[PDB]
Amino acid sequence: QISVRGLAGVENVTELKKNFNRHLHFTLVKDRNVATPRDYYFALAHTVRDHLVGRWIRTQQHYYEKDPKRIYYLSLEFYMGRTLQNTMVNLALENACDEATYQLGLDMEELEEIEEDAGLGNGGLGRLAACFLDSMATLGLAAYGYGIRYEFGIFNQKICGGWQMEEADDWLRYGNPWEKARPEFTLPVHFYGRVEHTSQGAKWVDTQVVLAMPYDTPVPGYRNNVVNTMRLWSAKAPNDFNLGYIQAVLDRNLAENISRVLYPNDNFFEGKELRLKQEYFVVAATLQDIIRRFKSSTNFDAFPDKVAIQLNDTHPSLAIPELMRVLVDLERLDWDKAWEVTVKTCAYTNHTVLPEALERWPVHLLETLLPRHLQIIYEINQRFLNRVAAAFPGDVDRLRRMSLVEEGAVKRINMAHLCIAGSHAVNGVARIHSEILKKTIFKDFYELEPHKFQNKTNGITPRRWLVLCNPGLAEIIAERIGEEYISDLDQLRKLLSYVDDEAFIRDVAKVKQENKLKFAAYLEREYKVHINPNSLFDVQVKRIHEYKRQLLNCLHVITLYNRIKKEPNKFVVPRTVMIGGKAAPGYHMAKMIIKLITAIGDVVNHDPVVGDRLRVIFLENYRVSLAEKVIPAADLSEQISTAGTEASGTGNMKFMLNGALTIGTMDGANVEMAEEAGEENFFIFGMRVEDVDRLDQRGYNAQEYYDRIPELRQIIEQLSSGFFSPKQPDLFKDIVNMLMHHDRFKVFADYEEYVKCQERVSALYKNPREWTRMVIRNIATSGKFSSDRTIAQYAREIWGVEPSRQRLPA
Amino acid sequence: QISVRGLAGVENVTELKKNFNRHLHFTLVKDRNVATPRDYYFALAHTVRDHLVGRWIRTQQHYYEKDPKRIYYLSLEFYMGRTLQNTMVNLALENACDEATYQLGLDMEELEEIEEDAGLGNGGLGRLAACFLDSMATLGLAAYGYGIRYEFGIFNQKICGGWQMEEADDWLRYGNPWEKARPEFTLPVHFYGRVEHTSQGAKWVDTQVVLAMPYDTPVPGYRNNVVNTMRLWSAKAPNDFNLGYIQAVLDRNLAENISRVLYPNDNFFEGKELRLKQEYFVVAATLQDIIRRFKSSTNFDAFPDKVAIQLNDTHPSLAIPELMRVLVDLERLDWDKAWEVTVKTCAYTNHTVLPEALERWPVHLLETLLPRHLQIIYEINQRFLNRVAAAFPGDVDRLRRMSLVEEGAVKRINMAHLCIAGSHAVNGVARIHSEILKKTIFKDFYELEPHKFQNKTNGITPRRWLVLCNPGLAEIIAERIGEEYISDLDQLRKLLSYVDDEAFIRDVAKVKQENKLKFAAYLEREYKVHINPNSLFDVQVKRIHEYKRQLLNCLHVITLYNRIKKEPNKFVVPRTVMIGGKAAPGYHMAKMIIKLITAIGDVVNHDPVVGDRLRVIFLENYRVSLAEKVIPAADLSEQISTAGTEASGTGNMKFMLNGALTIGTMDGANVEMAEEAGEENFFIFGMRVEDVDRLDQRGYNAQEYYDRIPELRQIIEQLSSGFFSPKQPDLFKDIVNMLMHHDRFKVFADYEEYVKCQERVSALYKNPREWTRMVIRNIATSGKFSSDRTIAQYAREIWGVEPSRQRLPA
Ligand SMILES: O=c1[nH]c(=O)n([C@@H]2O[C@H](CO)[C@@H](O)[C@H](O)[C@H]2O)cc1Cl
Ligand SMILES: O=c1[nH]c(=O)n([C@@H]2O[C@H](CO)[C@@H](O)[C@H](O)[C@H]2O)cc1Cl
């Protein structure tokens, strides 16, 4: 049907049909008469996976022969979503599969909806890892994603009486056709034990053993025949484990609980033992495999020329003392050389400056669990603080601030400090965030070693986030400029010369309208929810967090409602306001914010005076596959964190790529987005970082906004008095209380400028042609925010490898 | 190579090689350069499974079309062993695979040794189920084996310092290519809850739900293109399960512990909650599937014409009140009709008369776990005891003996009594065992309803137990008489006319010698153990149990040793005595018997005076695949249970089929074996059942044997005084104590006749020609003990179906 979806050759289609039928019969052990759509999905999924494997085997052999430097991306999170369409897209098989399945009398889109998301992440950080893997393979780097094969990913979210309820995401119930179990490469991981000293050094003894079993999933590059590997570890008990006989066998579960479940706290640290076991487990098993692979090239000096390890936040920071443990205790390198090797090998990415998100592990945990790694960390700390002392003689307060060991009621190890000490590069994830790091939390480190500190502004893969989810927009772009922009997103700049082309204006607005019609219909069929598709689609989707200020969004919605009630017969640009996202299970305030959002819809959506001029919809179970449907339907993107708190953001980029305009603070990557499109083509409002600090010094007093803004006071009074919760009049007193007295994120300070900026958006919306021209201006300047540009900077400036767009042979 | 192994056609071989290579590449994602033998096994296993599926699908469709009466074989045990060679054999693919793999430069036998046993049973009862499934499909019956997919089968046994040590049998580590997960047919099973009464009857409410997920494994008949199904259930948690969030997710394991592990107690009842959950789980899930399948034929009168359910011991006896629960509470049939349907549907097989092996569940368990099934069982008991009262008016003692409810400190439900009440047929497993049932434990039942009681003497599948494990013997048999005996074992009778054929005598003795040479070499390569292959191979392999009297065997071995020490220069027929078998984990005496056997080898095997005239070897980890190697190497089969205790035995048949002679008591099927071959062709010794009762009346006094038999006294003194345990002189005082004072099985009473009968065996062994002629006489009369004859009797006399040897189309 559409051009960027590849060829449907006679030979290809005929072949696909036969392999589809072979898998239906032989693999599924089904006959056409009892197959359900789910069986058809599987037959298709196995048929497409067949095309990968040859490429998978030849890529992995090519690396063994040529021996390039390898990149190991360690992360506790890989938010992959679905694999089928992405694989079709990267292999140019999409039109052929469509044809082949159409001829068997099936609808490929129906089938794609049956695939479970691999929800092995929480949000922005785990999805960055996913975009990165795709960019690494598109750019021909010999790169391996390593993590944990969680048996339950992020919980599925149900809304019940307006409240979030969690349920287990049993994503593997029906099998995962994409993975290949690799029990032959099972590896031991050690916990507990104690440290013995011999004449030949330290020895870690009496440990419990958990085996790590690898599962490999292929990662295809974009039409370059590269297929890289994501290797995820699964925990297994050893066979002599505790070996009532019956009880001994059942207790094997204690060991395998390590890979059972993903911790669902985003931007919040929970110091629980099970988490730290997961952290050590991925790092222990990954480093043996790395070293094994290196020894099949004695000489560790060349280790940093053959290996790069990227640490995705501090989660795998135990890689640093573990690499020392292996080099010093097992290989018998001396300390100083092991340390040189380790620093040259590791690099660390920070994703936050929020105090509560930083990992600081109680020393009593590390002591019990990892008594040798604690010893190594104290030694790292001592040698490091000696370099500090030597450089800032006398500055005792610097020593206590810079220490890897925090003193206090419970001593803690500050894992970020460890990473900066043992890495040759540390980077933030947007220009402003990187600057904040150097001026604030890591200032002392920066003065010590300014040359470690870098920026690598985040990006998103244009494959998933454009070609896969928005074929209509990819297609009209490609009619004008060709196809090359898909792996060179800077080419979108050529679209600037079409800003005054009447036919192009009309095709952009037409693609948006179609996407909105398709999303409106997904809403009714799957959730009996009922919307005007001519309305402006105002969307805020991301994890529920106070800093993300969904509450600010809420106050705007209530203000619009109150302005309609006050003058019902006055015209307003109609909106569909959609907010979506998961709250972590113990984050009480996040759960209250969800409940408020639904309580608002309850009032607003059934007010007959409002008509279809205002609807508030909470999007349930937001996740990757739902992002792919809603983002291309969006007209307005809400990116309204308090300035200084959102390290980068990446939703913001997905929306800009897909023809939504942005309303945002100068936060994170919003700053670079605006600078790329021109501030005139962006709806910026509210405090800058500088303004927030000024306010923090005087002191933030919210009563002051409440006394001066009648519209705001009326909302607060409606909240306290039970207007949004008539049977529980005090339902929301926690929120009101927090907003009035304990608001770390200054919702009231930005309210006024936010509302006025919201009027400027409705006004452009009234002028379709001029809305669409600003849209083209955004789309056209989104090139920088491709993950291919990001990974190329990592590769050149951190890993020391040269990207390559050259096809490997078929 | 050999004729009964099928054709190696050019076209077939060429095809196998290509599919082998396809699976290596696409399924295994390996290249020839890194494949290990284990990968080659898998490529072969998938290539052979491809040939099954077409037949599997067409068999299952043929039953749906024709709708014959279906047989449901319920068992908690299916001792399958390996599947690959058996599948090749039943599909006539064996020579072709041999050829095809030989041309890829591989050794098929090497590959077969990589397959794990499916050890989902304990011994004779779970292996009977396995032979039965094979016979049911060979005979074209529409039959389904239902049980439990245990994640850990019988433990692997290691001997350490002479002691058994257990370890978990992680048989699924590398995947099971034979099974097909069927998550689409997942079913709910209920536990706990309470019973409510409405105006519309009883209702079972507030239950916990465990899902049962089915895994299907194909069961091929012998060259008839029938492939039946073994469906095994796996326990899964529901998704809202308990739904700390983290803890809620981890506790999903409590539910899935139901299918985690096979209970390893054989012939001994352990009344543990986890066991009863397993029992209910298999029965609950199986009956829904049965009823589902029946409703795709409203009218329950025809239920017994469409369904037979065979109960393998009392383990699935909850089928009886569950079928009532479904008919009466769910379908709203009235009691009396539901009961007629249930009786006409169920039949029960007993496998033991040992008091300690019978299931008697505490009422407080059933009450908590299954409160509705307890109610139904009390109602069954009351109506049943009313029929007894009506028939034997006044006989109060009969009422208490026959009750399903045993009174006592804890009230118990006697599950055998339940089965006899709710089944139209009850059967023992050998003629003498069936007689004992009617004269003793079930006498009262027999007088009430004599027409329920039947015999179905056990059998073994000649496929596995002859063609698969003994190709050499199958082959010389087939040269003379053709191939038809493989599915008509009565034809072996024709071999009687070759008893005086010199060439045949020599080919039987040659096959035995070769098997012994191959087993001698398996012993050295895999266990550094060192034997004379010219010796008589004296073998007792079966679970370690006091009633099986491995101790009697032990005393004989010590007597031979002592006779050698007393006259070293006198000639004796040399023997290799091999004893093997697993002891259940808490059975202390069974573990001591293993330790004695090794302690004896320790003395005997290193006595330089003994030379290679006597060796005692404990065969470690006895299981199905080890049975297939040792049984055709055996010259002498030890079947020496105290008469009246071994219900049938089936090892005894495997040995007789494979050219070992039998030394045995008149116990179980030994009685019919001797009657088939002629008592002259069998080494029978010791008490008959009648003699045992006579001894029980006077009272068994072991001191009497010890005072009258000097050879026996010397053994006991050597045991007490530390001769077999010099560093622990009192190691064996438990055994001596038991033998002297508390021997339920009368080891001393049979000692004398056993030793003298052991001399008669050595004497025939001295005359190879005459040994071999008696062997031919056994082999030739083994036809009765085929499982095809057994299943044909079940089918005709119990299930009401007609077997058929007709091929389904290819
Ligand atoms: O726990 C976390 N989870 C997460 O999604 N991020 C995000 O990481 C994203 C990727 O860097 C980034 O765009 C966004 O600004 C961050 O909030 C950071 C932490 Cl520390
Ligand atoms: O728990 C058991 N396990 C077992 O193997 N059998 C055997 O069942 C075998 C099959 O009927 C039979 O030959 C043998 O005589 C029995 O001991 C019986 C019980 Cl009750």
JSON list of C-alpha atoms and ligand atoms in Angstrom, two decimals, chain A residues 123-126 128 265-268 313 315 351-352 357 429 458 547-548 646-650, ligand 1:
[
{"chain": "A", "resi": 123, "resn": "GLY", "atom": "CA", "xyz": [9.67, 4.96, 31.68]},
{"chain": "A", "resi": 124, "resn": "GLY", "atom": "CA", "xyz": [12.18, 7.33, 30.20]},
{"chain": "A", "resi": 125, "resn": "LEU", "atom": "CA", "xyz": [15.40, 5.62, 31.37]},
{"chain": "A", "resi": 126, "resn": "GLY", "atom": "CA", "xyz": [14.42, 2.11, 30.28]},
{"chain": "A", "resi": 128, "resn": "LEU", "atom": "CA", "xyz": [16.27, 5.28, 26.29]},
{"chain": "A", "resi": 265, "resn": "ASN", "atom": "CA", "xyz": [9.69, 2.96, 41.40]},
{"chain": "A", "resi": 266, "resn": "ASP", "atom": "CA", "xyz": [10.79, 5.55, 38.92]},
{"chain": "A", "resi": 267, "resn": "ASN", "atom": "CA", "xyz": [12.91, 8.55, 40.01]},
{"chain": "A", "resi": 268, "resn": "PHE", "atom": "CA", "xyz": [12.74, 7.32, 43.62]},
{"chain": "A", "resi": 313, "resn": "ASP", "atom": "CA", "xyz": [22.51, 5.41, 35.85]},
{"chain": "A", "resi": 315, "resn": "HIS", "atom": "CA", "xyz": [22.09, 0.86, 38.87]},
{"chain": "A", "resi": 351, "resn": "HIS", "atom": "CA", "xyz": [19.63, 10.84, 34.67]},
{"chain": "A", "resi": 352, "resn": "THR", "atom": "CA", "xyz": [18.53, 12.98, 37.65]},
{"chain": "A", "resi": 357, "resn": "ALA", "atom": "CA", "xyz": [16.28, 9.34, 43.28]},
{"chain": "A", "resi": 429, "resn": "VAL", "atom": "CA", "xyz": [21.36, 13.79, 29.24]},
{"chain": "A", "resi": 458, "resn": "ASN", "atom": "CA", "xyz": [19.07, 12.29, 24.58]},
{"chain": "A", "resi": 547, "resn": "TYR", "atom": "CA", "xyz": [7.97, 17.18, 39.70]},
{"chain": "A", "resi": 548, "resn": "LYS", "atom": "CA", "xyz": [6.18, 16.46, 36.35]},
{"chain": "A", "resi": 646, "resn": "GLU", "atom": "CA", "xyz": [13.38, 16.91, 34.30]},
{"chain": "A", "resi": 647, "resn": "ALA", "atom": "CA", "xyz": [16.91, 15.87, 33.29]},
{"chain": "A", "resi": 648, "resn": "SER", "atom": "CA", "xyz": [16.06, 15.60, 29.58]},
{"chain": "A", "resi": 649, "resn": "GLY", "atom": "CA", "xyz": [12.67, 14.15, 28.86]},
{"chain": "A", "resi": 650, "resn": "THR", "atom": "CA", "xyz": [12.15, 12.05, 25.63]},
{"chain": "C", "resi": 1, "resn": "LIG", "atom": "O1", "xyz": [14.68, 6.61, 37.66]},
{"chain": "C", "resi": 1, "resn": "LIG", "atom": "C1", "xyz": [14.76, 7.32, 36.67]},
{"chain": "C", "resi": 1, "resn": "LIG", "atom": "N1", "xyz": [13.82, 7.07, 35.67]},
{"chain": "C", "resi": 1, "resn": "LIG", "atom": "C2", "xyz": [13.81, 7.83, 34.53]},
{"chain": "C", "resi": 1, "resn": "LIG", "atom": "O2", "xyz": [12.97, 7.64, 33.67]},
{"chain": "C", "resi": 1, "resn": "LIG", "atom": "N2", "xyz": [14.74, 8.87, 34.38]},
{"chain": "C", "resi": 1, "resn": "LIG", "atom": "C3", "xyz": [14.65, 9.64, 33.17]},
{"chain": "C", "resi": 1, "resn": "LIG", "atom": "O3", "xyz": [15.70, 9.26, 32.22]},
{"chain": "C", "resi": 1, "resn": "LIG", "atom": "C4", "xyz": [15.27, 9.76, 30.95]},
{"chain": "C", "resi": 1, "resn": "LIG", "atom": "C5", "xyz": [16.37, 9.24, 30.05]},
{"chain": "C", "resi": 1, "resn": "LIG", "atom": "O4", "xyz": [17.63, 9.88, 30.36]},
{"chain": "C", "resi": 1, "resn": "LIG", "atom": "C6", "xyz": [15.26, 11.32, 31.03]},
{"chain": "C", "resi": 1, "resn": "LIG", "atom": "O5", "xyz": [14.86, 11.87, 29.80]},
{"chain": "C", "resi": 1, "resn": "LIG", "atom": "C7", "xyz": [14.33, 11.90, 32.11]},
{"chain": "C", "resi": 1, "resn": "LIG", "atom": "O6", "xyz": [14.58, 13.30, 32.17]},
{"chain": "C", "resi": 1, "resn": "LIG", "atom": "C8", "xyz": [14.61, 11.18, 33.46]},
{"chain": "C", "resi": 1, "resn": "LIG", "atom": "O7", "xyz": [13.62, 11.45, 34.46]},
{"chain": "C", "resi": 1, "resn": "LIG", "atom": "C9", "xyz": [15.69, 9.12, 35.39]},
{"chain": "C", "resi": 1, "resn": "LIG", "atom": "C10", "xyz": [15.71, 8.34, 36.53]},
{"chain": "C", "resi": 1, "resn": "LIG", "atom": "CL1", "xyz": [16.94, 8.66, 37.70]}
]
